[PDB]
Amino acid sequence: TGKELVLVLYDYQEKSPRELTVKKGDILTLLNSTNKDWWKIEVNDRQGFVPAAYLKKLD
C-alpha cells in the first residue's frame, strides 16, 4: 500500500483539520488505507483523511 486509487462515492464535508473535502466521483490516490474508519488521501496537494464508506477502493 501507498499510492493506490479510491473513488469518492459521496460529497464529503471537512469537519476536522485531519480530514479534507472531496467532490463525489473523484478518483483519488489512496495513501494510508489503514483504519477502517477514516482513510488518508491526497486531494490536490496536501493529504488528509476521509471516511471509508465514502471511498470505494479496488481491494
UniProtKB/Swiss-Prot annotation:
Residue span, SH3 domain = 1-59
Q: What domain of life is recorded for the organism?
A: Eukaryota
Signal sequence region? none
Subcellular localization(s) per the UniProt record: Cytoplasm, Cytoskeleton; Cytoplasm, Cell cortex
By sequence similarity, the record places it as follows: Belongs to the spectrin family.
Self-association state and partner proteins as the record states:
Like erythrocyte spectrin, the spectrin-like proteins are capable of forming dimers which can further associate to tetramers. Interacts with ACP1.
Role noted for this protein: Morphologically, spectrin-like proteins appear to be related to spectrin, showing a flexible rod-like structure. They can bind actin but seem to differ in their calmodulin-binding activity. In nonerythroid tissues, spectrins, in association with some other proteins, may play an important role in membrane organization.
Q: What is this protein called?
A: Spectrin alpha chain, non-erythrocytic 1
Write the lineage as a comma-separated list: Eukaryota, Metazoa, Chordata, Craniata, Vertebrata
Residue numbers of the full-length protein present here: 967 to 1025 of 2477
